[PDB]
Amino acid sequence: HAFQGRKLTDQERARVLEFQDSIHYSPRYSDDNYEYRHVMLPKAMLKVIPSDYFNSEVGTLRILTEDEWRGLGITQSLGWEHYECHAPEPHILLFKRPLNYEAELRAATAAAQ
**Minimum distance from CB of 42 to its own copies (Å)?**
27
Dihedral of CA 51/57/63/69: which sign?
positive
Cβ proximity of 8 and 41 under 8 Å: no
Query: What Rg, from alpha-carbon coordinates, does the chain have?
Result: 20
**Minimum distance from CB of 26 to its own copies (Å)?**
15
Number of amino acids touching its own copies (CB under 8 A): 4
b/e code 68-80 from CB counts within 10 Å (16+ = b): bbbbbbbeeeeee
When the beta carbons of 33 and 51 are compared against its own copies, the nearer one is 33
Does 33 bind its own copies (CB under 8 A)? Our answer is: no
Binding part of the chain for its own copies, among 67-75, 77-85, 92-100, 103-111 by CB under 8 A, reads 77-85
**Burial of residue 8, with CB atoms counted within 10 A of its CB: 0-12 exposed, 13-18 middle, 19 or more buried:** buried
**Minimum distance from CB of 73 to its own copies (Å)?**
20
**Minimum distance from CB of 90 to its own copies (Å)?**
23
Q: Which residues bind its own copies (CB under 8 A)?
A: 30, 77-79
